[PDB]
Amino acid sequence: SHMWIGVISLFPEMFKAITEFGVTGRAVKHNLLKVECWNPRDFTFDKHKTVDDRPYGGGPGMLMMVQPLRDAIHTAKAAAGEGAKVIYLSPQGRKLDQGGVTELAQNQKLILVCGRYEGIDERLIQTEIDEEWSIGDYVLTGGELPAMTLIDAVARFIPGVLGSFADGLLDCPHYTRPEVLEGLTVPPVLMSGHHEEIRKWRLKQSLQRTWLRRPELLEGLALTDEQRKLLKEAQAEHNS
Amino acid sequence: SHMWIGVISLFPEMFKAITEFGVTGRAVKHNLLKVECWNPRDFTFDKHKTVDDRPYGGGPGMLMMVQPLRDAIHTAKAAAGEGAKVIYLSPQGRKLDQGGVTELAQNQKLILVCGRYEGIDERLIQTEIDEEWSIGDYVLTGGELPAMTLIDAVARFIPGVLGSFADGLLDCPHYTRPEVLEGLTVPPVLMSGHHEEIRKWRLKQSLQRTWLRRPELLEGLALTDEQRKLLKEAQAEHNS
Numbered sequence A, B: 001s002h003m004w005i006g007v008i009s010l011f012p013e014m015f016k017a018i019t020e021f022g023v024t025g026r027a028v029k030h031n032l033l034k035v036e037c038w039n040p041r042d043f044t045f046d047k048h049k050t051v052d053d054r055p056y057g058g059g060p061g062m063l064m065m066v067q068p069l070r071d072a073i074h075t076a077k078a079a080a081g082e083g084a085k086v087i088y089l090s091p092q093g094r095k096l097d098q099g100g101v102t103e104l105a106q107n108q109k110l111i112l113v114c115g116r117y118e119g120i121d122e123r124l125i126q127t128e129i130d131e132e133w134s135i136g137d138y139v140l141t142g143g144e145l146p147a148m149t150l151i152d153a154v155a156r157f158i159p160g161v162l163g164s165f166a167d168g169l170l171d172c173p174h175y176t177r178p179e180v181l182e183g184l185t186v187p188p189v190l191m192s193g194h195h196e197e198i199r200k201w202r203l204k205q206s207l208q209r210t211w212l213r214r215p216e217l218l219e220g221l222a223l224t225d226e227q228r229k230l231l232k233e234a235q236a237e238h239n240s
């Protein structure tokens, strides 16, 4: 495959959501993407297959038990061979954005470690984890959805998986049939057949929407001469 | 149930990842959370159950077909009864963070619309959608993972679902057995049994980690006198 991703999770069946459906499911079926899961429960030795453990210092929660998680991680690393980057998903990690997705997608092999409970032993982060990433400033019940989100985002960069964050802007509005929907009409420019006017309209809309909704994103861009003009036009029309 | 969430998706089986496993799976089994899915494919009438359509103005992609998606949304609204907030997930939406999660969790009913392809008709956003939310500044292959992420995050607020974004800080490091792991020891304070010293250590660590990794998050906080002191201590030790 073109991208291999090993996953360490207590709930490997969750990953069916991306390996059996849609664009990512096609990528897996066609061997463009391989997702391989190891479950720490399988690396336990006690009768009840214990995968959590009490935190030193007390507190209300549990942590993942070190030995089964450590052994799972080592097994995944052995399978991966040389060059796999090991990632732990958590809110203490580097915040993911499309630039970070493009960076992560440069890797042919990733191992994604999915925390549950209050998380994992800090010393495992020091000894086993290459990078810590966050999918956003909110708290989930485990790292599985973040891992699946990251897999989905990077899969879009694998050649053959697909058939305006290309340029750091929000997307333009899109329209399809019918021509009139609850009294709302499709902008006539889009039915004009004028490819250049349509391209410019779309770009102007993207600039307007970014300015109105996410103005901080514009400050991170070096706008082209054309983008500067269309943004000025959109701002003047807003003030009209 | 305490929270009802209707979902509009071409891939309803993806939602098994949250309804059949872990904390969210328990919440569903115990009727604390209800997740109900409607698939636009079921609202088609042509032989091939067409759910996509061509965008006006051209371009490489497709959009969701209006009629089946609109009918699915209406059916979900009828099921929901009065007071359901309808949410479309996309990168053009309000960026989700834990504050936004706490806001969304105040709703007893939500309907989550999951886009595929290049998205949905802008006029459906105008006529059917109450709020647009984004789970982060990156692009996915559909709205299903964002929807599941949002469900998971809000489910944590339902009483009974659970057994440091409480205060806007990153989490402290956590440790569990064994006492020594690849030569790395557990901080002695955590094995002291001194509950107050442990609480203060944890808080100091959270302040230090937020300052080093996410300093912009500190500027949004009104630190307590205790937090100011511990942060000053951590900064002095860093400069020592």
Ligand SMILES: CN1CCN(C(=O)c2nonc2N)CC1
Pocket: A089, A090, A091, A115, A116, A117, A118, A119, A120, A133, A134, A135, A136, A137, A138, A139, A140, A141, A142, A143, A146
């Ligand atoms: C223990 N577990 C807690 C929940 N968690 C996250 O909320 C998360 N992961 O990636 N980005 C995030 N935010 C992962 C770790």
Ligand SMILES: CN1CCN(C(=O)c2nonc2N)CC1
Pocket: B089, B090, B091, B115, B116, B117, B118, B119, B120, B133, B134, B135, B136, B137, B138, B139, B140, B141, B142, B143, B146
């Ligand atoms: C059409 N579809 C494109 C992909 N998409 C997202 O990336 C997304 N959703 O919520 N936060 C996000 N970022 C949803 C809409």
